[PDB]
Amino acid sequence: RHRRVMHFQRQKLMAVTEYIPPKPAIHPSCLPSPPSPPQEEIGLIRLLRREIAAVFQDNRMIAVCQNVALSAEDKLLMRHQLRKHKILMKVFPNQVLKPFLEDSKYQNLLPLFVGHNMLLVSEEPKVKEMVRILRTVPFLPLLGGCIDDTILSRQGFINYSK
Amino acid sequence: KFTRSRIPEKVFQASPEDHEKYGGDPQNPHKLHIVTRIKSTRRRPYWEKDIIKMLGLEKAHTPQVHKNIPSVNAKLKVVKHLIRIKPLKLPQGLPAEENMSNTCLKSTGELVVQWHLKPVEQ
Amino acid sequence: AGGQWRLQQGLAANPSGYGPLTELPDWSYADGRPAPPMKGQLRRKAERETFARRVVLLSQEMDAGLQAWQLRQQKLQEEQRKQENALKPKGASL
Amino acid sequence: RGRIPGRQWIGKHRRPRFVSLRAKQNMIRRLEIEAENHYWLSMPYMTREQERGHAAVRRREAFEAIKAAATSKFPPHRFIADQLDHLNVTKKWS
RNA sequence: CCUAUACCUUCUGCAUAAUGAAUUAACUAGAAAUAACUUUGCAAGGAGAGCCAAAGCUAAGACCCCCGAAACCAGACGAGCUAC
RNA sequence: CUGGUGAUAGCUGGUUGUCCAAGAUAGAAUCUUAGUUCAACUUUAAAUUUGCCCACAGAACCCUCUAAAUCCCCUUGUAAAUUUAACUGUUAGUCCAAAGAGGAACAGCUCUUUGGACACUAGGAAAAAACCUUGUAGAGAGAGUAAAAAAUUUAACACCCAUAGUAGGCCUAAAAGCAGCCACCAAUUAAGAAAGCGUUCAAGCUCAACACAAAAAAUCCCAAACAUAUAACUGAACUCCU
RNA sequence: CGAGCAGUACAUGCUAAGACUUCACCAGUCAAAGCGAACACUCAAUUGAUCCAAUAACUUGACCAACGGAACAAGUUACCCUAGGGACAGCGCAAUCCUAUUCUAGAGUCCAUAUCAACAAUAGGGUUUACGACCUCGUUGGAUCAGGACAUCCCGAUGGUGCAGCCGCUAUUAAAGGUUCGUUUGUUCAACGAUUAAAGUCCUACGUGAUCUGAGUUCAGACCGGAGUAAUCCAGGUCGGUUUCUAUCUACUUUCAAAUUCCUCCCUGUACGAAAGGACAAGAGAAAUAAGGCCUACUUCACAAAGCGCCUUCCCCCGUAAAUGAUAUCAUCUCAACUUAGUAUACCCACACCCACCCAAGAACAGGGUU
């Protein structure tokens, strides 16, 4: 704070000897920024890829469902009922799951993973037992699935059960 | 307290970047100065007023020729803020006895020995 | 006005300083006889001559003082050689 | 409204002063002149040793002129012609 | 139109709202010695008794204001007002 | 009343033609600080020869250390200085910059020191003794410049979701993630032995996780204004020009 | 914080180059050589001129301490005198105080922020201050007339409330209007009494003494208390007590003309509330003040003036409360474009009858009438 009244000769000296930052001819933000340096893949990300590959390899029936915002009590109750029929509920992030399907046999399942999605898997294709559990909540849709490495829609699962 | 100012010897040491801006030559220093007072001795210390008298710079904007020697430079380093220092240039050389009445000091610092006041025929 | 421009052209900032507009005589007789030199021009001519003589005086004084210093160095160096000539070592040196 | 206690440019509470645009330019113009002065004072033509005694004769001769002028002060000559020329005040025609 | 803050005096600094002046005419305020200096005369002498002199001595020229107290003292004059 | 008496007044006031020239701030003593004397400064005349500026070299140790500098000072630039004679006059100066002093007092008051200006000119800061520019004097219906015009307008914002080994043990009427201490693991794709709130205590909640930068006073605001045409130009008694 | 000495010598003899110097002088200081002897004393200060006095000479003499020293002289004056000088207003970024913010500790059951608020910090304002780490002391009310500020006491509008309603508390906005009458007492201010919608804080040379007046500054007299030998003194107590001004200049001398407030009634005993209690907004009626007039009556009084009497009195207010809707496809009242709420009339006007008279017109002048 300039409490004391500086002499005008001194005041001019302060004004003339002011810092002048260098100004580039072209603003740096306007220039094309260099590509971001690459980083190392997250160890959890590569752990999911190994886990995801096991899911598609061990079990043959995979059911793609949208993880609706059901209450935790209702969502756990459905999971237990599916467990009685040995139906698991696998959930993986799409940012790791989509690239896995981009380089894989199941490359046509990419549009099915849009939003909150969950995977229902089982060693034995117990389609008929799974459908009746899903019929309890009319607002839980079955987007599609893949049985014996064959891509099918919800209608096929109804035909497969019958 | 306000006293005489001692200018560090480092200030009067020309850098390589200075010779390419003013056109001086350290290997061939100029022989004479052209000192011209461009500032008033009023509101300046008495020892600066005395040196101005010693250098014959009473009247402002009146060029005076001084020798480029350390003792004379010592007085110039005291009143360097009141004077303008320029080297004396002699493209035609030193004036002769027959050229004393035909010399003229130009604003560029050159002392010509032929002042005809006539447009160049070239 | 235009003082800075004139300085860049080798002219004086004030046009009244020097040049044809000032140094030349202001008038001459109708018969053709040149006019006597003006008082101001005579003052400038005397003033310029004193400046010119000082330039010659100062330039010759520095050269005289520079040659004189060189002669002292030459004389001093010669004195060193003279004192060693008149000595003939003997004894251990032989 | 707008009173400045005491005097404007003196005292404790003074009138604020601000640096204009041309005030900065004028100071920068002065600084460039002095910056070039530091350049021409960095290249002496002669050293301290060479310079010594190079003007002793002229300085000693110049002071003797001051001594001669100072020690030649004396009342002027009185002429008998001037005393007699006062008698012309009564000069008249016949 | 433009430019310009009456004078004197007293204070560091007065346009100062500090002092003095309405204005006119007349009147109203720097007197002198030693020394030194300057210019003549004469000169180891100078000066029209006396006085000075280790170049002095004699003569001239050339420097030192105005108004204003309350007081003190001496000698007179007053108690027709007033005190008794 | 007269006379001494034109009393005296370190006090107040006044002090009368022209023109030029040189010319301002250390102190000591004092019945003294309203004065005077001496010195310093200033003036005139004279005599003499150095004067100022200043290259090294040189000038203390302490109480442990530490400033701008100063003294001295050959060259050099310059022209003054010392001495002799005769006197007068001036002195709390003020403000600005800087370093300090007054019981270890940031400003202010008072008092030293260095320098400047003012009591001398002009120009510019609005008017302006002390800031800045500039000083040697006249005339001009010429010219080039010096200083020289204040900037600045300041606060949006997460989206979504959360079940559980449990009130983790301890002490507390009971205090539970949320009074307090210890330990700080743990199921689930992914959740703090809880980071804030609210319950006497619980309950409820959010988050972490998972996906997705002020201002106001007294007679009446105060130049008029203007974001847009290629920094030149204006500007002194400074300098130049007759 | 010291000094006004003391101690050791007894050649601490006599002479004499060159220098220092307390910014002058006076005074003070050092000193080679030489004579004469021996084989410039220590100590920061440790001191006093001249005149005079004493003495044969030598030498000595002052807390002359007011220490450059007068041979020797106190107090008091409000009875005072003379010559002069100085003096409400003005400066004050450290300390201190006040006001508003910042900080978020802490009070307020819980709860920073309904309110309040510690240590502090940042702004505005006032005040104090360089040395006896002593005691004391150096303009202001009233009458009249007011001008202005807003940091608002009342009236108005709008948020928050630990706001049910009435009252309150707090904050924003608002200076159009208003802000009483008395008793004591008075570094001239408080206390008390009765009211009021309220009895605002200041500034203006106590605002205002060529408009008036009281006290003080303080006085010529006088006592009481205290001080002093007395004269006399004391911000102490009390009594008494002289300034005047004929307005020269500036300014001003009908802003022609918009009114504020209270009570009662009404709504209403309504909304609210368990009741107690108790409103807004809208309207009406009577009041007081202010401003501007008037004389029918009343009254003071009579060709009239006047009030105690009578008559009339007309705009808004800018804090906020909300829609639509982007930057930021939601939302969001928007220093985004945008929408809504509250966001003038009246008076005066035509002008050479003019002698003179009259006049509700008037100092003169002017003006109205004279059919």
Ligand code: FES
């Ligand atoms: S102006 Fe270049 S990035 Fe926008």
Ligand SMILES: [Mg+2]
């Ligand atoms: Mg006047």
Ligand SMILES: [Mg+2]
């Ligand atoms: Mg005055």
Ligand SMILES: [Mg+2]
């Ligand atoms: Mg008068």
Ligand SMILES: [Mg+2]
């Ligand atoms: Mg007597």
Ligand SMILES: [Mg+2]
């Ligand atoms: Mg007497």
Ligand SMILES: [Mg+2]
């Ligand atoms: Mg009688």
Ligand SMILES: [Mg+2]
């Ligand atoms: Mg007299």
Ligand SMILES: [Mg+2]
């Ligand atoms: Mg006196």
Ligand SMILES: [Mg+2]
């Ligand atoms: Mg002069």
Ligand SMILES: [Mg+2]
């Ligand atoms: Mg001129």
Ligand SMILES: [Mg+2]
């Ligand atoms: Mg979360």
Ligand SMILES: [Mg+2]
């Ligand atoms: Mg010009």
Ligand SMILES: [Mg+2]
């Ligand atoms: Mg000039």
Ligand SMILES: [Mg+2]
């Ligand atoms: Mg001396």
Ligand SMILES: [Mg+2]
């Ligand atoms: Mg005395």
